[PDB]
């Protein structure tokens, strides 16, 4: 109803979250 790209950003953000999580997972 509103849009669709924002709902898709979830699959685009998980890529940045994967590397972002690995950095904190490796060193904190």
UniProtKB/Swiss-Prot annotation:
Highest taxon listed in the record's lineage: Viruses
Membrane topology reported for the UniProt record: Peripheral membrane protein
Subcellular location: Host membrane
Protein known as: Non-structural protein 5A
